[PDB]
Symmetry: C3
Subunit: 216 residues, 3 copies
């Protein structure tokens, strides 16, 4: 083994969002959640036409977006701002017997068949390990918390200590029938310093785009 | 004369969540609010069939569900995690004339006919008292906030401080008519140190049944 | 040359919310977000029957409401609670070319035709200024955020440090068709020391009212 990942030191002075970040780092600091009833009618039907189940598929669709726009791949290094070359999904796995949950991460690959292979190998392996973090944390990761129990009309996350916490969090809900369409609640949490409403806003339209494309 | 109530000094060692809690009490502490659009088509009918004001009937279903699951009835006592043997509801009552509000609790009984009687006797007495807390704090209590004004799609409660804030908060909304169906918005505020999305999920799942079941 | 706009200073002893404020400024201090699925059917058609841009007309209504109820026009001055005679709308404007946003404020007027003149000029003058605040801070203002990217079911704003931060914050979304009605997602965040659920409640019910009366 041996690694090293996407350092991309951004100098904040040549940045077109220099004071925006500056202000939301200090006095105006805040995170924010928005939630959408997401059309998944075509996604689900094409995910059921294949023998895969709706999770790694969706994980992948998000991971793709997170690995398109650098505004989601930002964190704090040695007192400096960086952009990871890649970000990997840290999803929740539930334990029926003990009623607890573990969060674990797979390695992201653009090719869906490659990624699902990594995912399946990881979940078929650690899916029954009771360690809170069975594979531990990793520098370059974003989060997806499954919430399959509830068809929520809002999921707000409310962090105590948000300092430099830029890594975005997705919470996803219990899908439901409504008209012809099958809708499914999805929520994001992002630190305002690294995401203007515009950024979050377009990614939720490309998420709507990619769910109507294919499995991955 | 005296009272003395509640306690089950939980050892962190044996607990199936020792690290979930530990990490959610420092490093990555937070709370989370989720909201749902609740079917009360069956509840409302049964409640309107009998001489019962809506409010106290709901406060009771919320009561039952708190006193079923150890996870809600948790608080930090003398520097330790305990689970109170029971938890009593603390509901808001509005003052017309002054346009302020008061929260007042009623001792919880599993038998509904008992509780509504203590609730009546409580509000008949204090409902026109202008004290913010006409009866005061009670170690072992959860919250219900009346919000009959807005048919809300979201309601986040954003605590400025959450250290050992474990007692949950409910907020119920202006119900309304839909497709032969009647829906009403509810929200929970919980601390992720004592409440995984699972617990909170099933408690909203039982809330459906208990509402599609009798008054109490 | 010189300004000086007046407060209406509040003494905490005579005020009917003397401990609602004191408590919600200390131990129980918090902010809260609620979102509504606002009906703008009437407000839209009447906007489109005139040659008026939607944004400024809405901004107007919001201010009309803000400047109708003192509870939204409260801030800290010199360790003292005050009430601004009037409060002005601080709205955002987006820049396509640089993918950032700037916030600027127009001076409020009851007369819609007057306000639109002042708005239109402010936007025609500063709309292409790449400065985060081309006009800047003014004590007596409330906030609006354009989020026309997403028909959100929930917008929650999770400010880091809420100390005395009383200025209310609106966020409006991508309006959408839904059977003979056109709904527009809207959210308010307010500080509970100056806004009870009832205060925010009626303001949204009058908001619905004005959106069914005229443009302004």
């Amino acid at each position: 083994e041996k690694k090293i990942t996407g350092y991309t030191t951004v100098d904040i002075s040549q940045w077109h969002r220099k004071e925006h970040f500056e202000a939301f780092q200090s006095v105006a600091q805040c995170t924010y959640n928005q939630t959408v009833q997401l059309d998944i009618t075509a996604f689900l039907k094409t995910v059921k036409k294949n023998k895969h189940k709706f999770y790694p598929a969706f994980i992948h669709i998000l991971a793709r977006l997170m690995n398109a726009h650098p505004e989601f791949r930002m964190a704090m290094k040695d007192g400096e701002l960086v952009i990871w070359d890649s970000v990997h999904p840290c999803y929740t796995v539930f334990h029926e017997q003990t009623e607890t949950f573990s969060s674990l991460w797979s390695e992201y690959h653009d090719d869906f068949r490659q990624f699902l292979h990594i995912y399946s190998q990881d979940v078929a392996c650690y899916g029954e390990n009771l360690a809170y973090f069975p594979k531990g944390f990793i520098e370059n990761m974003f989060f997806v918390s499954a919430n399959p129990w509830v068809s929520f009309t809002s999921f707000d996350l409310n962090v105590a200590n948000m300092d430099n916490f830029f890594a975005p969090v997705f919470t996803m809900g219990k899908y439901y029938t409504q008209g012809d369409k099958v809708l499914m609640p999805l929520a994001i949490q992002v630190h305002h310093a690294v995401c203007d409403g515009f950024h979050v806003g377009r990614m939720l339209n490309e998420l709507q785009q990619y769910c109507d494309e294919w499995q991955g």
